[PDB]
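Tokens for General control protein GCN4. Go.
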Amino acid sequence: NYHLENEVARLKKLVGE
């Protein structure tokens, strides 16, 4: 997962709602 896992939430919050 890595922060990438947190990144997915970070990126899916600004794009892909």
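The helical segments are 2-14.
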